[PDB]
Design a protein around this nucleic acid. Structure first.
Ligand SMILES: Nc1ncnc2c1ncn2[C@@H]1O[C@H](COP(=O)(O)OP(=O)(O)OP(=O)(O)O)[C@@H](O)[C@H]1O
Ligand SMILES: [Ca+2]
Ligand SMILES: [Ca+2]
Ligand SMILES: [Ca+2]
Length: 341
DNA sequence: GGGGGAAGGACTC
DNA sequence: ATGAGTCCTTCCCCC
């Protein structure tokens, strides 16, 4: 198999640049403002000028401003980047019927039956980068390898504006050399557990009693890493269909008071149903982030689809149930809908 | 034993 | 210390 993975460069910001070029070159920080106070919230994404100084996704906005007090700070415009994303995704479909849209800015393209070798693949990557640049003026990174995972690690290596190919021989190099912490799906919690077993590379998983491995990280993750390590990893490109839709907001102040949470919960439903857009959910979860940033939830599945009104009532029962079964305060409250008709 | 729903976890963009 | 969405584990009823 030959897989060509596409990953739009610092997407949200790059899109902000494209609508407003005068931003080119200046550090740009796109933010999600929470409402609690002046500048409360987090960084969603920053361009590379911004990134160069430690301003990256996930940190408080207030932090970023100490580091970069004269960078351009913009609020997230999800709906905009999404529309832009769609047109690009449409471009990529010109190059393969086998295409997995993994997220708003990630696509795996199975180009096995479209190129005869990697030389031809790299060329197609060049040709794709151009198509997008021509049509939308959005640069991207192309990663090419034998399975999805390495295709992405390729891109992780070549970004931004890059194109890299990890051949069958580099794969084995990486299976021995690459820090296992840089393996897609390995976060700190797991990375630690791995270090804790001496496991610092992919190869190491082949010389450790499976159960010792299973024991720590669990079956799926153990199998996943081992299969990667044995060069036997195959997950195929699949058209992806959303499995859930939801919305969680932050309350202006923390509470356990049912009627104070009520309105935040209701706006969340209103938005969720807007986004459902003619998809009929059978299941609903109310989801609260506790005052100490813990995440609690209560759900319910019906035998039938859920109307906005049933969503309203049931969500109160579910929020109520959350309250009944935890004595902590709520900080964010939201809802999530799944099991579509 | 293990299928299958609920709730928590961990990860990623 | 945002917001969104996914897959997996653990506990449990049940067959
Ligand atoms: N922690 C986060 N919170 C909110 N949005 C995020 C976060 N991380 C990434 N995104 C969104 O994902 C999109 C793609 O991410 P981006 O290209 O900036 O990251 P990169 O690909 O690692 O470089 C961005 O436009 C934004
Ligand atoms: Ca990415
Ligand atoms: Ca990206
Ligand atoms: Ca990692």
């Amino acid at each position: 198999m030959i897989v060509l993975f596409v990953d739009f460069d610092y997407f949200a910001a790059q899109v902000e640049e494209v609508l407003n070029p005068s931003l080119k070159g200046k550090p740009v920080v796109v933010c999600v403002f929470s409402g609690r106070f002046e500048d409360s919230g987090a960084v969603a994404t920053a361009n590379y000028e911004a990134r160069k100084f430690g301003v990256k996704a996930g940190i408080p906005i207030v932090e970023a401003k100490k580091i970069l007090p004269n960078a351009v700070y913009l609020p997230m415009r999800k709906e905009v980047y999404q529309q832009v994303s769609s047109r690009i995704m449409n471009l990529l479909r010109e190059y393969s019927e086998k295409i997995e849209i993994a997220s708003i800015d990630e696509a795996y393209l199975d180009i096995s039956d479209k190129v005869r070798d990697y030389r031809e693949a790299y060329n197609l990557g060049l040709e794709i980068k151009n198509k997008i640049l021509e049509k939308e003026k959005i640069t991207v990174t192309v990663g090419i390898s034998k399975n999805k995972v390495f295709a992405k690690i390729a891109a992780d290596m070549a970004k931004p504006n890059g194109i890299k190919v990890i051949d069958d021989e580099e794969v084995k190099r990486l299976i021995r050399e690459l820090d296992i912490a840089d393996v897609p799906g390995i976060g700190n919690i797991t990375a630690e557990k791995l270090k804790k077993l001496g496991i610092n590379k992919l190869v190491d998983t082949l010389s450790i009693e499976f159960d010792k491995l299973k024991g720590m990280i669990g079956e799926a993750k153990a199998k996943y890493l081992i299969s990667l390590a044995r060069d036997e990893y195959n997950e195929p490109i699949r058209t992806r269909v959303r499995k859930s839709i939801g919305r969680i907001v932050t309350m202006k102040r923390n509470s356990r008071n049912l009627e104070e949470i009520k309105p935040y919960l209701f706006r969340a439903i209103e938005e969720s149903y807007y986004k459902l857009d003619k998809r009929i959910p059978k299941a609903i979860h109310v989801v609260a982030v506790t005052e100490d940033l813990d995440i609690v939830s209560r759900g319910r599945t019906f035998p039938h689809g859920i109307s906005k009104e049933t969503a309203y009532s049931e969500s109160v029962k579910l929020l109520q149930k959350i309250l009944e079964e935890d004595e902590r305060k709520i900080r964010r409250i939201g809802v999530r809908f799944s099991k579509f008709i």
